């Protein structure tokens, strides 16, 4: 009953934090062609298990820092 | 047979010493129940031009099968740079069209229709386009015959 | 507002009798000028007309016979278009359902103007109350009667006498002894005269 997202890690330089890129495909409101839209989310990684290139899952939570509100749940595939 | 005069114009030819003036007329004739035609006439005065136009119109006729008192399906047509769109309407609507389309449609016997012109509104080309559209509009029995199915199968 | 002035010139311009006169004398003898327009350039009906002219003249005839002005007439047409059915049929039913028209066809008025005067002066009661608005729509089953103060009135007696010579409508059940009538249904198109061509008015307002 919690909101989860699936994405690909694009950075792990900072301490205990990962940057994951989420991708979605939506229709253009007027021209009707399906277009690709992406967003960047800062998540929380307690043990630095995540790396660059892996496909991961995150879930929403209470704030952990200024820009982090998501926590890693599981690593689906390792780079 | 209902006879309608769409347009009359005066044309000029240049010769030495001055000009020669003449008149052109465009007419549409129709029985009112599925037969219609149109024609043009040229003469140096209006009565003769009109008579020639009516004669040519009565020579140029077709048969169009309506669905009751309206079209069978939406129609797009064009002749040259004139384009016309016509669409069937329910009872009580009337004929919503310009003068040139209205003449042809009333002569053919359509009572409820919505029509629109795009491009040039030259009378002869508009009448031509409406004529071709009406001529080429089809019917369920023809569709079923050409496909080899039945009318209830076609729906 | 309400039209006041010469009446016969309207009929002469329209080309027919619009019965604004009581009817004791025929229109032709009354005017001596029918078949000619009332202007200094008056001509015969054989002059050419445009489609716009025909449409306008058709609607004007209905407006003059029923005494209705342009704003109310446009409101009537909008209502008839909104209601289901034939638009001209609905418009004619709406025009016939007016209280003053019902009084005229029930006979207490020699002319629609006289009926309207009576209604305005509260000589006519709908159901059981003294109304004074001539545009009220009369509904099926309503009972129209003359006020007891308005009874034994010479104009009413003359009006019923002329109505007796006139044809009694099918949809109105009226007794002239106590001067009371009952409405039952809206007159239909076949009941109405075939002179009026509602299609022209519909085409005009559809433009």
């Amino acid at each position: 009953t919690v909101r989860t997202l699936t994405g690909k890690v694009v950075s792990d330089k900072m301490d205990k934090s990962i940057v994951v890129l989420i991708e979605r495909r939506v229709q253009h409101p007027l021209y009707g062609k399906s277009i690709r839209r992406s967003t960047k989310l800062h998540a929380h990684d307690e043990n630095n298990v995540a790396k660059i290139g892996d496909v991961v899952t995150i879930k929403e939570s209470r704030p952990i820092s200024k820009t982090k509100a998501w926590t890693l749940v599981e690593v689906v595939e390792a780079a | 047979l209902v006879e309608k005069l769409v347009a009359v114009d005066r044309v000029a030819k240049v010769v030495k010493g001055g000009r020669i003036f003449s008149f052109t007329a465009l007419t549409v004739v129709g029985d009112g129940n599925g037969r219609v035609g149109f024609g043009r006439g040229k003469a140096r005065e209006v009565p003769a031009a009109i008579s020639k136009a009516l004669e040519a119109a009565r020579r140029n006729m077709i048969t169009v099968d309506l669905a009751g008192t309206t079209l069978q399906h939406p129609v797009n047509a064009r002749h040259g740079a004139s384009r016309v769109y016509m669409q069937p309407a329910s009872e009580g609507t009337g004929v919503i069209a310009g003068g040139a389309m209205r003449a042809v449609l009333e002569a053919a016997g359509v009572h409820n229709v919505l029509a629109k012109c795009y491009g040039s509104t030259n009378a002869a080309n508009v009448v031509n386009a409406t004529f071709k559209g009406l001529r080429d509009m089809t019917s369920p029995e023809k569709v079923a015959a050409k496909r080899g199915k039945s009318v209830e199968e076609i729906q | 507002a309400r039209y006041i002035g010469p009446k016969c010139k309207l009929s002469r311009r329209e080309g027919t009798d619009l019965q604004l006169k009581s009817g004791v004398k025929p229109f032709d003898v009354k005017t001596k000028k029918a078949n000619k327009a009332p202007g200094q350039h008056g001509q015969a009906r054989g002059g050419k007309q445009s489609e716009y002219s025909l449409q306008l003249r058709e609607k004007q005839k209905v407006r003059r016979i029923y005494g209705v002005l342009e704003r109310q007439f446009s409101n009537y047409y909008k209502e008839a278009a909104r209601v289901k059915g034939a638009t001209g049929e609905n418009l004619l039913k709406l025009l016939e359902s007016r209280l003053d028209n019902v009084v005229y066809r029930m006979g207490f008025g020699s002319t629609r103007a006289e009926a309207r005067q009576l209604v305005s002066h509260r000589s006519i009661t709908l159901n059981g109350r003294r109304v004074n608005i001539a545009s009220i729509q009369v509904k099926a089953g309503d009972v129209i009667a003359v006020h007891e103060g308005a009874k034994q009135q010479l104009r009413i007696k003359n009006a019923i006498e002329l109505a007796a010579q006139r044809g009694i409508p099918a949809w109105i059940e009226v007794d002239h002894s106590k001067l009371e009538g009952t409405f039952k249904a809206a007159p239909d198109r076949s009941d109405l005269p075939a002179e009026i061509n509602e299609s022209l008015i519909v085409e005009l307002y559809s433009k």
Binding site: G32, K33, S34 | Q72, P74, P88, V143, I154, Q155 | -
Partner: protein
């Protein structure tokens, strides 16, 4: 290069009908075979044949003429690689008031718009035929 094989098939059929051929052949695929089966069931074409001489497969269609005119008078691609078109069950288009057909790809297979509306499902609109 060649990027729309369905449009290629429809264009070949239209040009063959305009030139009054009796048959039209093309490289085959299961999607074109399904579309041809739908057309044959609806009665716009006569016969569908697939010849598998080797790894290559060739589809052959037999055309129909009636009163000196082609039976297929209009065929139009609707969804295309540069703009895909999807519709729900309540917005499936009608081709000239139901006298034509619209080919629809649904999760239950390729069918007509009438059949899709009967089954209460939607999908991708491939072509209009009339």
């Amino acid at each position: 290069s060649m990027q729309d094989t369905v449009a290629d098939m429809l264009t070949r059929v239209r040009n063959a009908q305009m030139a009054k051929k009796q048959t039209v052949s093309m490289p085959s695929s299961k999607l074109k075979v399904a579309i041809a089966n739908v057309l044959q069931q609806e009665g716009y074409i006569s016969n569908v044949e697939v010849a598998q001489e080797e790894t290559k497969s060739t589809l052959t269609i037999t055309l129909k003429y009636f009163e000196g005119k082609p039976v297929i008078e209009m065929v139009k691609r609707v969804s295309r690689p540069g703009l895909r078109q999807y519709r729900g069950k309540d917005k499936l288009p009608s081709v000239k008031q139901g006298l034509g057909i619209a080919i629809v790809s649904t999760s239950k297979g390729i069918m007509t718009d009438r059949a899709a509306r009967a089954a209460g499902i939607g999908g991708e609109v491939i072509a209009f035929v009339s």
